[PDB]
Ligand binder design. Structure first.
Ligand SMILES: [Cl-]
Ligand SMILES: [Cl-]
Ligand SMILES: [Cl-]
Ligand SMILES: [Cl-]
Ligand SMILES: [Cl-]
Ligand SMILES: [Cl-]
Ligand SMILES: [Cl-]
Ligand SMILES: [Cl-]
Ligand SMILES: [Cl-]
Ligand SMILES: [Cl-]
Ligand SMILES: [Cl-]
Ligand SMILES: [Cl-]
Ligand SMILES: [Cl-]
Ligand SMILES: [Cl-]
Ligand SMILES: [Cl-]
Ligand SMILES: [Cl-]
Ligand SMILES: [Cl-]
Ligand SMILES: [Cl-]
Ligand SMILES: [Cl-]
Ligand SMILES: [Cl-]
Ligand SMILES: [Cl-]
Ligand SMILES: [Cl-]
Ligand SMILES: [Cl-]
Ligand SMILES: [Cl-]
Ligand SMILES: [Cl-]
Ligand SMILES: [Cl-]
Ligand SMILES: [Cl-]
Ligand SMILES: [Cl-]
Ligand SMILES: [Mg+2]
Ligand SMILES: [Mg+2]
Ligand SMILES: [Mg+2]
Ligand SMILES: [Mg+2]
Ligand SMILES: [Mg+2]
Ligand SMILES: [Mg+2]
Ligand SMILES: [Mg+2]
Ligand SMILES: [Mg+2]
Ligand SMILES: [Mg+2]
Ligand SMILES: [Mg+2]
Ligand SMILES: [Mg+2]
Ligand SMILES: [Mg+2]
Ligand SMILES: [Mg+2]
Ligand SMILES: [Mg+2]
Ligand SMILES: [Mg+2]
Ligand SMILES: [Mg+2]
Ligand SMILES: [Mg+2]
Ligand SMILES: [Mg+2]
Ligand SMILES: [Mg+2]
Ligand SMILES: [Mg+2]
Ligand SMILES: [Mg+2]
Ligand SMILES: [Mg+2]
Ligand SMILES: [Mg+2]
Ligand SMILES: [Mg+2]
Ligand SMILES: [Mg+2]
Ligand SMILES: [Mg+2]
Lengths: 174, 174, 174, 174, 174, 174
């Protein structure tokens, strides 16, 4: 309807892209939530994996909130969609979950880069800076950490070695 | 598949009901999230309403987590479903959002009572106690608070009086 | 005359644009100064409006100083111009002054976006980053705050309700 | 229009003279601002001169604010005018800027004495006392300090001796 | 060989440019190291010049390390090259060394701007932001400081006046 | 050219040998730097190896600085040369890097012993004592530590056992 009194240099496409990204961040939150409680099962029982993915879940929820804040700051209107359940109910092993987290973070990062591209094409430097400042380096760090974790788990003998996942749990995530 | 080594006196129906309740708690989280950012809009701008519903959103997420913990404690398996978006994108007024929160909490409470009934019919006193201890009185308190809020807002002249919602924001939620 | 020993990748156009922006920031300072003392009049007497716009005036003066610092950092030369008096001597009401502050901040923001465009066209990433870092989000925040304030004042019954402006003074600005 | 409910023994001429003096104080603020950033240039680079004139600039702005406060206290109405840019963009040397500051403060003092004369002729002892209390001795002190500074700089060999200005910067202003 | 599991939107050209910049930062470290110990000679004996350039040397080494960190973060592979010795063994005077430091920092800055250009052409906003955030303003500050120092030394009578360099040593670098 | 006013009992050969040793210490610094960031790669990811070699790199740089200090103390003149890149870009494994560090420290030690021999042949007891005091026992300690590390890694099953390097990382270097 009529324009927001605050809206300036904020393209409708960018508004819609921010609504999509909000959904994605909430989806990531939900994936990490599912992973966490997988490690809390009595037949998995890797409680530092569980803590680690729980913390990641809460961070994703903050990423979503900051985008919702941003939408309103710029005078867009938030439109929420269903948060899809994760692909998996069973995440298999410590290694497998880390690998899927890595794929998830690379996908979120690709979405954030597309979003930056759009912002760039619509000459929205405030939005460019927002993405750069609060999102892009956060993704690079998260991706590098996950790569590091996957590498160690593999080198240690995961997923075959239940010993390896147990010791990684204690020494890296603990 | 084969039974959990921990599972004892935990009926499959109760397991499924706990998975439904987890979805509902996450749905409630999402409703309150949507309400919160509605009050953060530049054309609504009731920042204590926004804080209040944000805090409610985070509490719902903890309610969901405790049920996920419970599922595993008892040796059930968590099965997550889509978190539906809320009915509304636009919550109209402070009064209207409080009213919808009240309806939401009464629905969650009805689900929790049904769940207690099932637990009772399957002679699961641990599950009865869990629900009683962490959920039922929490719902009674939340419902009474919301009723109190709705009552004050109405008595003050909401929703017509923008003054009333502004002062309720400062004095009750502030 | 001969080039600054420090100057590198700093186009003359960008130098001139920074001198214009310095004038604008000082002009904004002066507007807020005028508004402030309007609320200090014995026939207006809204002392938190007065404090609020005084603080905004001092911030604008810091924005101007940082641009003057920047000019010298980059090896440009500051050229100062008259600081025009504000459009208004009489700002009418709390609501009207907030509305004019909103229009002022949107104009400053448009100038800052034009300046970013120029910096972008002249491939000055240091200048891009400067603007992004210290100016653009500051404008988005200031604009959103003002929108929020205008909205509340309107909803409360301003400008007709002298009660509304008095209570906004105490509860939001106080 | 109709008289201020607070106005008593405050002649219109005095009201107008206070509006002129407010402009002058803001003009002085602006001169000192310009001088300050001159010393911040990479080809001047006397950072304590810069600090010293910056502090003087901020003080002038407070002098202007106190006169604006006074106007309202007495029930006059503030009428703001353009703040003219300074005579100079380039202040030449430490010595030259101090000399121009001295001339500026003697001019402000002459205006303040004229203003006192008017106040005296209109039998406004409150206004007499205001000027005496917050302005006249402040000017005498500022003038004597500047004279002292000019004298030292000259005795040291300024402006020819770049060494002299550098050491004055460190030892007197530092 | 096969791609890094972490690599995303990171062009080979950018990877190579980061390896070049790492060499340059180490080269800058080495220049400042050489300058420092020049001032530690018994026939030069300006111990605050020596401290100042030593600190600059250590900072350059940190700049190099952060680029090496960045390379790995992004999934590039570090390729190190010889660190060339400095042009000079004998830096002549305080003034001459400052002048050469200024030329060095302007060259590093030109390399960093070229690198930003490449990053921009390959649509790598994370890399753009990295450069902006940790490098470009650091260069602008370092260049302005050096300009300031060169200016003072010249104004004081350097390099002919051994007195001037000695007093600059004590008062500016001390 | 003409002799240093401070120079006494300091043979030109010793002066040249100290310049060579300075190059070697910087070369060692550079080797350890390269090793460190190898362990920071996402496909190696042994962050305590990385810390350990980084710390060794910084120590080598201090060893180089103390020799540069010494050169000037004695009235020699520092002549810097290119710092060659390390032999390796890829250090293979934790065990392999430790082994190469051991070979590096034994080479530095052989150079330091040659240098002591020269100092002895030129009857420079101050230089003898310098080497003894700040270098020789430091090398013996560093060599013994590295031997200890290599031994443990081998006994643990390195380099085949990625588990072994991971646990050594946590327990010995951590
Ligand atoms: Cl727009
Ligand atoms: Cl649009
Ligand atoms: Cl949907
Ligand atoms: Cl980082
Ligand atoms: Cl059972
Ligand atoms: Cl059953
Ligand atoms: Cl579903
Ligand atoms: Cl109770
Ligand atoms: Cl009230
Ligand atoms: Cl109150
Ligand atoms: Cl230029
Ligand atoms: Cl140009
Ligand atoms: Cl003008
Ligand atoms: Cl923000
Ligand atoms: Cl009167
Ligand atoms: Cl009169
Ligand atoms: Cl005017
Ligand atoms: Cl006095
Ligand atoms: Cl890539
Ligand atoms: Cl490529
Ligand atoms: Cl090479
Ligand atoms: Cl800065
Ligand atoms: Cl002195
Ligand atoms: Cl000798
Ligand atoms: Cl000899
Ligand atoms: Cl060489
Ligand atoms: Cl020992
Ligand atoms: Cl342990
Ligand atoms: Mg994270
Ligand atoms: Mg995220
Ligand atoms: Mg589905
Ligand atoms: Mg950019
Ligand atoms: Mg950042
Ligand atoms: Mg609640
Ligand atoms: Mg609940
Ligand atoms: Mg639907
Ligand atoms: Mg209870
Ligand atoms: Mg502001
Ligand atoms: Mg501003
Ligand atoms: Mg005019
Ligand atoms: Mg920022
Ligand atoms: Mg003063
Ligand atoms: Mg004054
Ligand atoms: Mg004019
Ligand atoms: Mg008297
Ligand atoms: Mg007095
Ligand atoms: Mg530096
Ligand atoms: Mg550098
Ligand atoms: Mg060569
Ligand atoms: Mg920055
Ligand atoms: Mg060592
Ligand atoms: Mg060594
Ligand atoms: Mg070679
Ligand atoms: Mg010893």
């Amino acid at each position: 309807a009529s324009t927001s009194q605050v809206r300036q240099n904020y393209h409708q496409d960018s508004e819609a892209a921010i609504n999509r990204q909000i959904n994605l961040e909430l989806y990531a939150s939900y994936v990490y939530l599912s992973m966490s409680y997988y490690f809390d099962r009595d037949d998995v029982a890797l409680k530092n994996f569980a803590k680690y993915f729980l913390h990641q879940s809460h961070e994703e929820r903050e990423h979503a909130e900051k985008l919702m804040k941003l939408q309103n700051q710029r005078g867009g209107r938030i439109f929420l969609q269903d948060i899809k359940k994760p692909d998996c109910d069973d995440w298999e092993s410590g290694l497998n979950a880390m690998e899927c987290a890595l794929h998830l973070e690379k996908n979120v990062n690709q979405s954030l880069l597309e979003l930056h591209k759009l912002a760039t094409d619509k000459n929205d430097p405030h939005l460019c800076d927002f993405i750069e400042t609060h999102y892009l380096n956060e993704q690079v760090k998260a991706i590098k950490e996950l790569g590091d974790h996957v590498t160690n788990l593999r080198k240690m003998g995961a997923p075959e070695s239940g010993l390896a996942e147990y010791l990684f749990d204690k020494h890296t995530l603990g």
